[model samples]
Target: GSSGSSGGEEYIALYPYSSVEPGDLTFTEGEEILVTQKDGEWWTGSIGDRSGIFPSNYVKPKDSGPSSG
Candidate 1:
């Protein structure tokens, strides 16, 4: 089954973005995120135990397949 295994679900931060509260997700340069949903230019994702919105332009979607490892 391909349940929730959609493409481009992972992202890598290209710049620093943060939230004021503890529950909000934060990202620094070159950080990985598990994207849950996307709305307009904003994307919702979780880092560690925190989840929040970040600009889609701020992060690049990771390739959806295994490569040379």
Candidate 2:
């Protein structure tokens, strides 16, 4: 429930997704991802040392609380 105590938004993969091509992210269900930057539907994030873009639908925000305005 906690990670990267420093910074960067976090997300959790809901389903297993593999990289379809280069520059895409491959993640498994329940894996924690540290999002670097979000670019619309294609959000760029990292799982460990790997960082790339993945479909926003593949993962959900780690924090379900009301942080939005």
Candidate 3:
């Protein structure tokens, strides 16, 4: 139910200030990934049910991130 896209995919596009790589979850340009948890500088997320840790500083918020009430 949390899937935000029409294809039931939850993810965000990257808009990093510099080059960044997935610590555990490797993703390609334009690849959509599902976010699970967030921290000060890191986020534990998943893509295709494959979980990994990525940098919060390297990602841009998605339209599906969270909506207003």
User: Backbone clashes in each candidate structure, one number apiece?
Assistant: 0, 0, 0
Query: Is 1 or 3 the stronger prediction by lDDT?
Result: 1
- Prediction 2 global C-alpha lDDT: 0.84
**Over 4 Å off in model 1, which ranges?**
1-8, 21-24, 64-69
lDDT for 29 (candidate 1): 67
Q: Name the candidate, 2 or 3, with the larger lDDT value.
A: 2
Clashes of 3: 0
TM-score of each: 0.68, 0.75, 0.55
Residue 48, model 2: lDDT of 73
Model 2, residue 69: displacement in angstroms?
30
Better of 1 and 2 by lDDT: 2
Evaluation by TM-score, superior candidate among 2 and 3: 2
Tens digits of per-residue lDDT, candidate 1, 1-69, equal 556444437789888887686554688968888788887778787777667888788888675576558
Angstrom error of the Cα, residue 36, model 3: value is 1.1
lDDT of each: 0.77, 0.84, 0.59
- In Å, residue 42's CA in model 3 sits off its true spot by 0.4
Candidate 2 lDDT over residue span 1-69, tens digit each:
757355677899989888778778888989998898989878898977888888888888897676768
TM-score, ranked from best to worst: 2, 1, 3
- Arrange candidates by lDDT, highest first: which order? 2, 1, 3
For model 3, give the 10-residue run with minimal summed lDDT.
Answer: 15-24
